[PDB]
Symmetry: C3
Subunit: 333 residues, 3 copies
């Protein structure tokens, strides 16, 4: 609710970065300039290069939408920036630096908006959001072929093997302290406790409810994995949190009106997001590749598509969907 | 066509088991209380534990739909029970017993109805039924991650390997006798001739035509596999029947009006269901996992979606679709 | 624009081969009798057996549509022939001859039209074409199971392995000369320079623009692969051209109105088609199977679905879509 006159002051370059500011927030569904800025802050706190590659992905994807002529409202809301952000981080997270790295980030960001547009047209038939699938599909397509096209070289995180039952480690208070905040950091490939805290503060600025569901998701994803007898190391590193962080955020009052029934619904989703993390990890291990946020995407899509069938689960028209605070105030209109 | 007064006698607990009775029948698309009861009978004849785990899956999935508030008509028809039934059997069929087994069956049953609702909303745009895909997707998601989450331990049926050409065995009269009825038993993971016979009698009670297509499907799936030079062992064990049993049933006058053209159409589908069994078996072998009824699902979806394009193949509006006897009597309205 | 009286001369057997003539052209989206004839010519120039197996697939698929009762206009345009053509070549390209080869080609052709009908009904909701996906899905289903059903034996091109980084070879003028025309030949599994030239002449007969985009696609797919540091051998053999040939053709003024913006759009697609070739090749290597034209299909579907979102990219209503020359003349109506 800013003064309408402030628009006399808009030049297209400050309009562009506002798109970038919010694009980044929309990685965790927060349509908020400051949230995104603070996301950047947190990534930059962990690494300068991932910081620039996050910005370039966001910039590359947002620009591509404008060049292609996406409706200005979609572009202004950050929906064509979120997946670019992740496309820019994932690539130097998984591959060793080569000069061509930046060009490839540009390509991957550019590709995300093609796919964002694809999914919005496809899923639009059911009012289901595209979530972060543009980044997963683009990045898989650009990463899988690395054994056949040697421009980049895979980092040691990528190692083809048949799955098998492998030791177990030891749960300590640290397992919990570190798993929690890295769970949140790992939403954007940030192996860093402080970054994760920064990310919660960043969400908190836009919404207390979403910040709380981000914390809960991470805890739910974490203890689901221990209940399921994961080795301690993946769990301390937030590997079983971050899909559930995203579940927590999206289910926890953004796409459904927060109440006691929608809350239990969101709990179901956070748990299955952790279990699905094991599932796609295994499915992709013969080619050594990361499932990324596909466990969040599949589970969440499942719960979103089911919504219109369940009368005790109150769905938000996606056209409308704002923060959980705003959705409840709106329902009282 | 029961007296309407009989509803003065309905208490919610007898309403619940009627849902469970029919849920189970709907594993082979038979909206029939007695059929389901006899399915239970047959499973129980083979094993008491698979019997209870079948009931708990059915109970867990049906309850979840009611808790979530699915339209009472959908719940009363067993559509939210069929996939729960299978989710409850598959888990102790493939994994060794651990105390947590029952909770996990509850979880898996619960998950099926989420997915049932998902698919009904998605596929509803084309009037295409969800078949048994809720169970396949839920169970894959809950099974694949077992190498990474060690709560359960995979049975010896699960063994990651690269595919290769492997001896051939010897076809005998027994190959046929046993392959036929285990083909039907294996629709519900019942390695048992008597169970299979029980299952045919169970279908027969509701529909002679469906019982006949279940027999034919099994034979078609069986000899397709020999024509294709399968080793004798998978074929005697009904492994190449049961996807074709399901094809036979669904195509054979439930979703299409039985005539000479629809019959040949159903033959096409039963054959490709056998070939697809080899296909998904291979696709999933690097991670050692069962395709389950995915070969039936893909092929059948293909033929169902094609239906509205082929004018010589008379489709049933899925809203209406009852037994093959009732569909023909209805067409004569 | 032939005299309408010429239809007094039509007997159903000459109507049938006209369907076969155009079916074959429609493998590269050319609704043109002579183009298809010349495609046949070119295949036959390379091999007599692939020639007959191309015709039988085309014949088997086209007949199945007529037997099933597809709208005569769809059948007359070759849309139910293109995928049959490829189903007939792929099978003896990848498997050693066995007597049953021809029956299987008939089966595979027959299956393509089921899937053509499936996809047309499914994708019809967005006006998106089915491209060559009927052939990929049918052929995968009929090929993957070969390790479990030994009727055919895989040729040495099929060899299950975990991916890994493998020497590099040496780019010469020949890499380019041979890569270019085999890029075009390989659209139909024709490892033959002359065949490829024949194919360009064949397209040229129907459309200069499409013939040019076929050449460009092949070059773009080729140098993308070198930029990406592919070994020289796959590139000289046209393995990185043919998905991009198809991209080039479909994007280059058939499905979008050719202009400076649509051209850059098509460039994006051709590049990602090459990168996706590496991607699906890797994804399917644990089971040793060819991605075929899936890299073209996924990328192209992505750009097609995105179309209606991008206002600077002018889409063709698919109902209407003819050659790029005719689309521009139509836009001037
Ligand atoms: Au800025
Ligand atoms: Au800004
Ligand atoms: Au900014
Ligand atoms: Au900012
Ligand atoms: Au949003
Ligand atoms: Au950078
Ligand atoms: Au970088
Ligand atoms: Au715990
Ligand atoms: Au806990
Ligand atoms: Au009962
Ligand atoms: Au009962
Ligand atoms: Au009952
Ligand atoms: Au009963
Ligand atoms: Au039914
Ligand atoms: Au049990
Ligand atoms: Au059990
Ligand atoms: Au036979
Ligand atoms: Au037979
Ligand atoms: Au002819
Ligand atoms: Au002709
Ligand atoms: Au012809
Ligand atoms: Au011809
Ligand atoms: Au066309
Ligand atoms: Au032949
Ligand atoms: Au042949
Ligand atoms: Au080059
Ligand atoms: Au070049």
């Amino acid at each position: 609710g800013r003064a309408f006159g402030e628009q006399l002051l808009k030049n297209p370059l400050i309009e562009f970065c506002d798109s970038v500011c919010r694009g980044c927030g929309q990685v965790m569904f927060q349509n908020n300039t400051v949230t995104g800025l603070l996301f950047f802050a947190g990534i930059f706190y962990n690494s300068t290069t991932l910081g620039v590659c996050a910005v370039l992905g966001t910039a590359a994807s947002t620009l591509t939408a404008q060049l292609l002529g996406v409706d200005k409202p979609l572009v202004r809301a950050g929906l064509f920036g979120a997946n670019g952000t992740l496309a820019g981080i994932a690539l130097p997270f998984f591959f060793n630096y080569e000069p061509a790295m930046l060009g490839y980030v540009a390509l991957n960001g550019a590709f995300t908006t093609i796919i964002m547009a694809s999914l919005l047209n496809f899923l639009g038939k059911w009012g289901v959001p595209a979530l972060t699938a543009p980044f997963v599909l683009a990045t898989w397509l650009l990463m899988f072929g690395v054994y056949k096209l040697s421009l980049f070289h895979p980092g040691a995180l990528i190692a083809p093997a048949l799955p098998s039952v492998a030791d177990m480690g030891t749960v300590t208070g640290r397992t919990f302290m570190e798993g929690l905040f890295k769970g949140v950091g790992e939403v954007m490939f940030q192996d860093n406790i402080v970054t994760g805290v920064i990310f919660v503060v960043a969400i908190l600025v836009n919404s207390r409810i979403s910040a709380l569901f981000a914390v809960i998701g991470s805890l739910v994803g974490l203890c689901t994995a221990l209940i399921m007898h994961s080795p301690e190391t993946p769990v301390r590193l937030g590997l079983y949190g971050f899909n559930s962080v995203l579940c927590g955020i999206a289910m926890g009052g953004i796409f459904f009106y927060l109440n006691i029934r929608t809350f239990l619904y969101a709990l179901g989703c956070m748990v299955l997001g952790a279990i699905a993390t094991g599932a796609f990890s295994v499915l992709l291990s013969p080619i050594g590749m990361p499932a990324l946020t596909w466990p969040f995407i599949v589970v969440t899509w499942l719960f979103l598509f089911a919504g219109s069938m369940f009368r005790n689960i109150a769905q938000v028209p996606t056209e409308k969907a704002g923060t959980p605070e705003d959705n409840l105030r709106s329902l009282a209109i």
